[PDB]
Write a protein that holds these residues in place. Structure first.
Motif, PDB file in Angstrom:
ATOM      1  N   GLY A 103      49.081  71.745  92.230  1.00  0.00           N
ATOM      2  CA  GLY A 103      47.825  72.439  92.412  1.00  0.00           C
ATOM      3  C   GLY A 103      46.866  71.517  93.124  1.00  0.00           C
ATOM      4  N   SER A 104      45.824  71.099  92.420  1.00  0.00           N
ATOM      5  CA  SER A 104      44.872  70.164  92.987  1.00  0.00           C
ATOM      6  C   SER A 104      45.544  68.840  93.303  1.00  0.00           C
ATOM      7  CB  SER A 104      43.704  69.944  92.030  1.00  0.00           C
ATOM      8  OG  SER A 104      44.145  69.351  90.824  1.00  0.00           O
ATOM      9  N   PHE A 105      46.562  68.488  92.526  1.00  0.00           N
ATOM     10  CA  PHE A 105      47.179  67.180  92.685  1.00  0.00           C
ATOM     11  C   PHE A 105      48.696  67.213  92.723  1.00  0.00           C
ATOM     12  CE2 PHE A 105      46.187  67.804  88.182  1.00  0.00           C
ATOM     13  CZ  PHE A 105      47.409  67.591  87.582  1.00  0.00           C
ATOM     14  N   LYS A 106      49.265  66.225  93.405  1.00  0.00           N
ATOM     15  CA  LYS A 106      50.706  66.133  93.558  1.00  0.00           C
ATOM     16  C   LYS A 106      51.329  65.264  92.480  1.00  0.00           C
ATOM     17  CE  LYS A 106      50.552  66.616  98.598  1.00  0.00           C
ATOM     18  NZ  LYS A 106      50.769  65.913  99.892  1.00  0.00           N
ATOM     19  N   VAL A 107      52.208  65.868  91.693  1.00  0.00           N
ATOM     20  CA  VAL A 107      53.017  65.128  90.742  1.00  0.00           C
ATOM     21  C   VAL A 107      54.144  64.438  91.498  1.00  0.00           C
ATOM     22  CG1 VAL A 107      54.612  66.999  90.252  1.00  0.00           C
ATOM     23  CG2 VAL A 107      54.209  65.239  88.518  1.00  0.00           C
ATOM     24  N   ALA A 108      54.662  63.351  90.944  1.00  0.00           N
ATOM     25  CA  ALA A 108      55.824  62.687  91.511  1.00  0.00           C
ATOM     26  C   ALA A 108      56.683  62.120  90.393  1.00  0.00           C
ATOM     27  CB  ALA A 108      55.397  61.597  92.466  1.00  0.00           C
ATOM     28  N   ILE A 109      57.996  62.179  90.571  1.00  0.00           N
ATOM     29  CA  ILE A 109      58.924  61.785  89.523  1.00  0.00           C
ATOM     30  C   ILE A 109      60.038  60.930  90.105  1.00  0.00           C
ATOM     31  CG2 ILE A 109      60.575  62.595  87.806  1.00  0.00           C
ATOM     32  CD1 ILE A 109      58.941  65.193  87.683  1.00  0.00           C
ATOM     33  N   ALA A 110      60.441  59.893  89.379  1.00  0.00           N
ATOM     34  CA  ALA A 110      61.512  59.030  89.850  1.00  0.00           C
ATOM     35  C   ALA A 110      62.204  58.295  88.712  1.00  0.00           C
ATOM     36  CB  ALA A 110      60.975  58.035  90.862  1.00  0.00           C
ATOM     37  N   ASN A 111      63.319  58.846  88.249  1.00  0.00           N
ATOM     38  CA  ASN A 111      64.143  58.162  87.267  1.00  0.00           C
ATOM     39  C   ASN A 111      64.732  56.888  87.859  1.00  0.00           C
ATOM     40  OD1 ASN A 111      64.436  60.047  84.747  1.00  0.00           O
ATOM     41  ND2 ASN A 111      64.600  61.398  86.531  1.00  0.00           N
ATOM     42  N   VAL A 112      64.683  55.796  87.106  1.00  0.00           N
ATOM     43  CA  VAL A 112      65.272  54.553  87.579  1.00  0.00           C
ATOM     44  C   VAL A 112      66.729  54.513  87.161  1.00  0.00           C
ATOM     45  CG1 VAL A 112      65.175  52.044  87.581  1.00  0.00           C
ATOM     46  CG2 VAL A 112      63.082  53.392  87.408  1.00  0.00           C
ATOM     47  N   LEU A 113      67.571  55.156  87.954  1.00  0.00           N
ATOM     48  CA  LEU A 113      68.979  55.256  87.627  1.00  0.00           C
ATOM     49  C   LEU A 113      69.686  53.975  88.023  1.00  0.00           C
ATOM     50  CD1 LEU A 113      69.628  58.904  88.819  1.00  0.00           C
ATOM     51  CD2 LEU A 113      69.273  58.110  86.477  1.00  0.00           C
ATOM     52  N   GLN A 114      69.607  52.972  87.161  1.00  0.00           N
ATOM     53  CA  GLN A 114      70.280  51.715  87.429  1.00  0.00           C
ATOM     54  C   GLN A 114      71.781  51.909  87.493  1.00  0.00           C
ATOM     55  OE1 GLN A 114      69.039  49.071  84.290  1.00  0.00           O
ATOM     56  NE2 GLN A 114      67.338  48.272  85.519  1.00  0.00           N
ATOM     57  N   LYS A 115      72.437  51.099  88.313  1.00  0.00           N
ATOM     58  CA  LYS A 115      73.883  50.993  88.247  1.00  0.00           C
ATOM     59  C   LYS A 115      74.245  50.441  86.879  1.00  0.00           C
ATOM     60  CE  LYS A 115      74.482  50.168  93.185  1.00  0.00           C
ATOM     61  NZ  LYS A 115      74.859  49.149  94.202  1.00  0.00           N
ATOM     62  N   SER A 116      73.351  49.617  86.342  1.00  0.00           N
ATOM     63  CA  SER A 116      73.459  49.148  84.969  1.00  0.00           C
ATOM     64  C   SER A 116      72.877  50.197  84.036  1.00  0.00           C
ATOM     65  CB  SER A 116      72.737  47.813  84.791  1.00  0.00           C
ATOM     66  OG  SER A 116      71.347  47.952  85.033  1.00  0.00           O
ATOM     67  N   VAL A 117      73.562  51.333  83.959  1.00  0.00           N
ATOM     68  CA  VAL A 117      73.186  52.439  83.090  1.00  0.00           C
ATOM     69  C   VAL A 117      71.776  52.959  83.390  1.00  0.00           C
ATOM     70  CG1 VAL A 117      72.893  53.203  80.702  1.00  0.00           C
ATOM     71  CG2 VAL A 117      74.688  51.548  81.285  1.00  0.00           C
ATOM     72  N   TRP A 118      70.760  52.306  82.836  1.00  0.00           N
ATOM     73  CA  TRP A 118      69.406  52.844  82.879  1.00  0.00           C
ATOM     74  C   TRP A 118      68.339  51.772  82.681  1.00  0.00           C
ATOM     75  CZ3 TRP A 118      66.665  56.657  84.540  1.00  0.00           C
ATOM     76  CH2 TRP A 118      65.393  56.893  84.012  1.00  0.00           C
ATOM     77  N   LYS A 119      67.122  52.057  83.134  1.00  0.00           N
ATOM     78  CA  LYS A 119      66.001  51.155  82.910  1.00  0.00           C
ATOM     79  C   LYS A 119      64.856  51.849  82.188  1.00  0.00           C
ATOM     80  CE  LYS A 119      63.877  47.245  83.195  1.00  0.00           C
ATOM     81  NZ  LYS A 119      63.428  46.714  84.508  1.00  0.00           N
ATOM     82  N   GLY A 120      64.256  52.833  82.845  1.00  0.00           N
ATOM     83  CA  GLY A 120      63.121  53.538  82.279  1.00  0.00           C
ATOM     84  C   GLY A 120      62.461  54.445  83.292  1.00  0.00           C
ATOM     85  N   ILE A 121      62.036  55.620  82.842  1.00  0.00           N
ATOM     86  CA  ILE A 121      61.428  56.604  83.725  1.00  0.00           C
ATOM     87  C   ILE A 121      60.139  56.056  84.318  1.00  0.00           C
ATOM     88  CG2 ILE A 121      60.307  58.868  83.831  1.00  0.00           C
ATOM     89  CD1 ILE A 121      62.242  59.822  81.694  1.00  0.00           C
ATOM     90  N   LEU A 122      59.910  56.337  85.596  1.00  0.00           N
ATOM     91  CA  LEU A 122      58.672  55.942  86.249  1.00  0.00           C
ATOM     92  C   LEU A 122      57.979  57.119  86.912  1.00  0.00           C
ATOM     93  CD1 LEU A 122      59.692  52.552  87.888  1.00  0.00           C
ATOM     94  CD2 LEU A 122      58.313  52.909  85.848  1.00  0.00           C
ATOM     95  N   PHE A 123      57.102  57.781  86.167  1.00  0.00           N
ATOM     96  CA  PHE A 123      56.260  58.813  86.750  1.00  0.00           C
ATOM     97  C   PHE A 123      55.298  58.239  87.773  1.00  0.00           C
ATOM     98  CE2 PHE A 123      56.523  61.891  82.914  1.00  0.00           C
ATOM     99  CZ  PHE A 123      57.789  62.247  83.318  1.00  0.00           C
TER     100      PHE A 123
END
Lengths: 179, 155, 78, 94, 207
Positions: free
Chosen positions: A105-125
């Motif tokens: 709407g007024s603002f753009k959301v953005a999403i980016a999962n940190v899909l490490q080759k080493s399983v996982w790190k942490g979501i970064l909105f």
């Protein structure tokens, strides 16, 4: 264009959020961190650090960062990778971050999962808004609506501010990943 | 591929017709051929077209549904959806009356008048259970038209 | 009579205060003295920099960004 | 046909050339924007109407409410019709 | 990108005729001026390849840029090359070497070679003409010495009073694995070779 960023300890929420999304889908943001260390110690530090990263950008420029400690230089190649490949710089991991910016709407959301080759790190909105006015009269408004959809308990590096700035911020955020 | 084109061009028409009344056509429900328009600016009701024919399917899940047939149901455009809205809010009101009967079953009471066009197949002046299309009737005589609807109720 | 519509213009200044929720009010007040002497949500969607306008007794344009009290001549008080 | 004021605002690529070599390049796949400041209300603001037909590979409305993106000119016409209608209803609101 | 180079000496005594010839039988001419730079690696012990081609070669078109400016050294566009050695015992058919056309865009340009620890080495200016032929292209060389280090003010210094013009046919294979594209390329260069052998004597040269 007031950028915002958040880290989390709660993996795979956005996957559950996208069906819950009520609004427009657009380009799928993704970029590529990479580990780099010189094959031999003689490039110790400072002028020639063992540190280096190339930051692929799927937005538009495709201009890799060429940082030897605070030494930004944009470069489309890629071919530079192969150039570096000779007689230098060991690999180990990239742990690249896929993810999928949406108009709302007024603002753009953005999403980016940190899909490490080493399983996982942490979501970064990530978040952007047209904070054309003073940001501190706008940022709290931005924070009013992390309640919708609701968000709780997180690491929170969300600096005040077009998306190019993020590149400059990537290493700054790369530090958060150093641990 | 041509099938994809026939499928897509109709969307190209409707999206231009989607400007009035933000039919975002959210795909968070289903990508089945029947199609899924949304609504604004606000469980969520879901107005739709497919046959082509007038149709309503609120769902989450899958809730109450009903169909109607005004106009040729072929070409648009925006003006036709402007016709849709008038009857549509009335249909939402009827959904509310059904919320009442769901928890007397049922009141013969109806309008509760609202805008605007009388061309609706939804249609108007709904009574207990089945709708009683006779809003045009005088309020004293509306009881009599409702009695005619009762005569229809016998069959 | 006109003073009431001008009071509605003051309500528009209050809307500018709502934008503050989202100095100039004093100069706007002096302008209110100058004047007394004689849909919008979609504009916010345009803000979502903006422009808007209000009818009666003159088609003043409620431009906003700060704010720009555009009006119609084509005078536009700061 | 209904007599309404408007302001056509052309800007052709070939408006600027100092030789035939430039005029040669004036003809290209480039977008050709054309503004259309149509005048309706004597009070409410004119509805800007961008027009950008790309050569290959068009009617972007913009009013007091919100921007729109069409294709057929007829949709632009009916889009005007929403204003001649609903704005008139706004005149009838008071 | 596996380039397919060729070489051909042109005595300056007869050079103009070659130009009048090529202009009437090839695309272009397009004007060519460029300022090479080499920034030297300096590390010990081996294994450093430390090969004469291993020394890096930044490149920069300079022709369109005006001579008067002195801040061209970074403001000008830049690129980076490697150019590995040609494959061994390659005769008759053209020699073939790997090449990588890197590019970059920032206010920090030259500095990066120092960031790699590399330092200034030999440099030289090229001038001449290029000629298109679909994919394949032929460029002619003049390796003028700059009047001053990193200076763009004419006259530039010839290596000798009678510098040969160094003709250089080439084409850029997208990848070595495709013998099909290799065939099309070898074919095109073969046709070029036939096309201009009538007034020049090209030959494969080891590198």
């Amino acid at each position: 264009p007031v950028h915002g960023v958040i880290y989390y300890s709660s993996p795979s929420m956005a996957t559950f959020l996208s069906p819950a999304q009520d609004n427009l889908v657009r380009t799928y943001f993704a970029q590529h961190l990479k580990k780099w260390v010189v094959q031999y110690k003689l490039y110790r530090n400072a002028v020639t650090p063992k540190t280096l990263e190339f930051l692929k950008q799927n937005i538009n420029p495709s201009m890799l960062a060429c940082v030897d400690e605070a030494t930004m230089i944009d470069a489309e190649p890629e071919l530079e990778d192969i150039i570096v490949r000779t007689k230098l710089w060991n690999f180990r991991q990239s742990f690249t971050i896929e993810g999928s910016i949406y108009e709302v709407g007024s603002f753009k959301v953005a999403i980016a999962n940190v899909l490490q080759k080493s399983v996982w790190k942490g979501i970064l909105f990530h978040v952007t808004y047209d904070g054309t006015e003073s940001v501190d009269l706008a940022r709290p408004i931005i924070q009013e609506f992390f309640l919708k959809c609701f968000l709780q308990n997180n690491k929170s590096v969300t600096p005040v501010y077009l998306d190019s700035k993020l590149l400059l911020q990537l290493f700054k955020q790369r530090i958060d990943t150093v641990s | 591929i041509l099938n994809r084109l026939y499928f897509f061009c109709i969307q190209t028409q409707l999206l231009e017709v989607a400007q009035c009344a933000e039919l975002h056509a959210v795909q968070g429900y289903y990508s089945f051929p029947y199609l899924t328009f949304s609504k604004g600016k606000w469980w969520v009701l879901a107005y739709n077209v497919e046959s082509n024919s007038w149709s309503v399917r609120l769902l989450n899940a899958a809730g109450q549904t009903l169909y109607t047939q005004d106009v040729h149901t072929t070409k648009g455009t925006l003006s036709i959806e402007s016709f849709s809205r008038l009857s549509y809010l009335l249909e939402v009101q009827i959904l509310l009356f059904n919320v009442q009967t769901a928890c007397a079953a049922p009141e013969m009471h109806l309008i509760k008048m609202n805008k605007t066009a009388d061309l609706t197949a939804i249609l108007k002046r709904i009574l207990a259970i089945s709708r009683k299309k006779x809003x045009x009737x005088x309020x004293x005589x509306x009881x009599x038209x409702x009695x005619x609807x009762x005569x229809x109720x016998x069959x | 009579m006109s003073l009431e519509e001008q009071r509605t213009r003051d309500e528009l200044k209050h809307k500018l205060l709502d934008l503050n929720q989202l100095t100039i009010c004093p100069s706007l007040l002096k302008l209110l003295h100058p004047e007394t002497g004689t849909v919008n949500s979609f504009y916010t969607h345009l803000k979502s920099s903006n422009d808007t306008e209000n009818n009666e007794t003159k088609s003043i344009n409620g431009k906003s960004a700060k704010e720009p009290h555009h009006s119609e001549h084509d005078n536009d008080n700061f | 046909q209904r007599d309404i004021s408007f302001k056509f605002m052309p800007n052709y690529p070939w408006e600027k050339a100092k030789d035939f070599l430039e005029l040669e390049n004036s003809l290209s796949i480039n977008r050709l924007s054309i503004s259309w400041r149509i005048m309706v209300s004597n009070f409410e603001p004119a509805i800007f109407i961008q027009h950008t037909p790309t050569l290959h590979g068009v009617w972007r409305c913009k009013d007091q409410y919100s921007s729109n993106q069409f294709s057929s000119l007829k949709n632009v016409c009916q889009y005007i019709e929403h204003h001649i209608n609903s704005l008139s209803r706004r005149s009838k609101k008071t | 990108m596996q380039e397919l180079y060729l070489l051909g000496v042109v005595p300056s005594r007869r050079f103009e005729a070659v130009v009048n010839s090529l202009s009437k039988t090839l695309d272009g001419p397009k004007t060519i001026l460029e300022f090479w730079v080499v920034y030297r690696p300096k590390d010990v012990p081996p294994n450093l390849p430390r090969q004469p081609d291993s020394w890096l070669r930044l490149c920069s078109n300079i022709e369109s840029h005006d001579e008067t400016d002195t801040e061209w050294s970074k403001n000008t566009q830049w690129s980076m090359y490697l150019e590995g050695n040609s494959e061994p015992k390659r005769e008759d058919k053209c020699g073939i070497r790997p090449v990588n056309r890197a590019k970059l865009t920032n206010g920090s340009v030259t500095e990066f070679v120092e960031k790699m620890g590399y330092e200034f080495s030999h440099e030289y200016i090229i001038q001449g003409l290029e000629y298109f032929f679909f994919d394949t292209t032929v460029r002619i060389y003049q390796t003028l010495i700059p009047s001053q280090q990193r200076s763009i003010k004419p006259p530039f210094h010839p290596m000798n009073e009678e510098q040969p013009w160094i003709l250089h046919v080439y084409t850029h294979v997208a990848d070595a694995s495709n013998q099909v594209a290799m065939a099309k390329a070898e074919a095109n260069l073969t046709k070029v070779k036939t096309l201009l052998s009538a007034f020049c004597d090209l030959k494969n040269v080891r590198l």
